[PDB]
Amino acid sequence: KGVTQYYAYVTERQKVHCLNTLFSRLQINQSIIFCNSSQRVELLAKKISQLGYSCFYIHAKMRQEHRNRVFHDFRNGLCRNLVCTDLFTRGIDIQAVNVVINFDFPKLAETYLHRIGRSGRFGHLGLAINLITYDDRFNLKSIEEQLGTEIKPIPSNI
Amino acid sequence: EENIQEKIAFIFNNLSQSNMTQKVEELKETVKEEFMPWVSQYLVMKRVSIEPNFHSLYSNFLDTLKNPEFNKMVLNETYRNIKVLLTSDKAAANFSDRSLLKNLGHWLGMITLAKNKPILHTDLDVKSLLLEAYVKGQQELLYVVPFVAKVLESSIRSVVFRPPNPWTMAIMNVLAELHQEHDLKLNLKFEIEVLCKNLALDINELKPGNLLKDKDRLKNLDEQLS
């Protein structure tokens, strides 16, 4: 809570196109982009890196020492964006992160709250953008029900 | 046009020290001379104003682009946006506008004083701003004193404008007079104390004058808060 939450309906195939649009329309100080698996993190990161994004990635198939080095460098602004999975962002507080992108929508309310909390800093407005496929509809409802909140559609200006 | 604005936003969203040279080349490939005014407005209004953690980055970007006409545009836009905020209706609760003004002040110092370039009185008369704020009351001082501090923070990083530069010290001595005032808020006295420390100055070695007692001077200032 403390962050504005939006969603857009997309297909899996269209997600990178959507990401490119978001990163061409939003004001991103730093962002964290969440995916649902290590393989998907690494593939996405290599791909957007080739296209000129500034990004590091973190996931499960790394040593903790390495993840700690990448987080440290990310906090120091050596890259603008971090692509990562859930398991390892526990307790990370980087004040500059003003945008969280759920590139893959999570399956659980607990995970959802942990993720979007990464863009919420006291005295700073944050934004969470959720890419929702047809297959994510039941989990979107469950999560909205549990939190007692409505995730609004992306504004027209995007 | 919208396609080119998108590319510009993408570039600033993905700018880092390590890709700076490459992103500058891409920006030059993208932004034709006729687009540079829009880019200057975008940089100041949408980035610098709310991304103070990347002020060094964006300052370094200007040094790398090496376009003096663009630099002039950016400075003019910085002053313009400062003035929009200086002439606004002031409320303590408007934390957002106060922060925007502080950030623009921080940036202003970084692209003038920290580069050994003056803040010209024709653009912004900093001493007079303080005196006017005093006249107009605590709500104006709440915006203006932290703004001036963020500007002057840069002076210590200037071989030209570091203390005891007379322009810098004239402002510091007015801040010293304000610091004496019975009803200046303790938070603002602290702002002045922190500025002194940031400038390696002892507040007690400053020389407050009698400008705040000069009611004719105060009544006749060239107004900057309207």
What is the arrangement of strands in the sheet containing A81-84, beginning at the earlier edge strand? A55-58, A81-84, A30-34, A97-102, A126-132, A3-9, A152-153
How many angstroms separate the CA of residue B138 from the nearest CA in chain A?
23
Q: Structure resolution in Å?
A: 1.8
Burial pattern B96-111, b for ≥16 Cβ within 10 A else e, equals ebbbbbbbbbbbbbbb
Inter-chain residue contact B57 with A52, CB threshold 8 Å? no
**Which residues of chain A make contact with B7, given a CB cutoff of 8 A?**
24
- In three-state secondary structure terms, A29 is coil
Going from N- to C-terminal start, the domains of chain B cover 1-226
**Number of other CB atoms surrounding residue B140 within 10 Å:** 18
**Which H or E element spans position A55?**
strand A55-58
d(CA B75, CA A75): 29
Residue A76's φ and ψ, nearest 5 degrees, are: -85, 0
SS (H, E, C) B142-211: HHHHHHHHHHHHHHHHCCCCCCCCHHHHHHHHHHHHHHHCCCCCHHHHHHHHHHHHHCCCCHHHCCCCCH
**Which residues of chain B make contact with A79, given a CB cutoff of 8 A?**
16, 18
Task: Give the angle A146-A151-A155 at the CA atoms, nearest 5°.
Answer: 175
Residues 72-131 (B) with a CB less than 8 A from some CB of A: 95
Which top CATH class is A1-158? alpha beta
Residue A34's φ and ψ, nearest 5 degrees, are: -95, 135
How many angstroms separate the CA of residue B140 from the nearest CA in chain A?
22
Question: Chain B within 8 Å of A16 (Cβ-Cβ)?
Answer: no
Let me know: does A52 contact B14? Beta carbons within 8 Å: yes
d(CA B125, CA B118): 11
DSSP state of A82: E
User: Structure tokens of B210?
Assistant: 């009698």
User: Structure tokens of A88?
Assistant: 């390892």
User: Structure tokens of A20?
Assistant: 């490119």
Pick the CATH number of B1-226 from 1.10.3300.10, 1.25.40.180, 3.40.50.10070, 1.20.200.10: 1.25.40.180
Beta bridge partners of A128: A5, A100
For the CA atoms of A93, B149, B191, B91, the dihedral, rounded to the nearest 10 degrees, stands at -80
Helix ranges, A79-126 (H): 109-116
SS (H, E, C) B4-41: HHHHHHHHHHCCCCCCHHHHHHHHHHHCCHHHHHHHHH
d(CA B58, CA A94): 20
d(CA A44, CA A144): 27
Handedness of CA B126, B128, B131, B135 (dihedral sign): negative
User: Structure tokens of B96?
Assistant: 């957002």
**Who contacts B167 (Cβ-Cβ below 8 Å, separation ≥6)?**
B118, B161
- In three-state secondary structure terms, A99 is strand
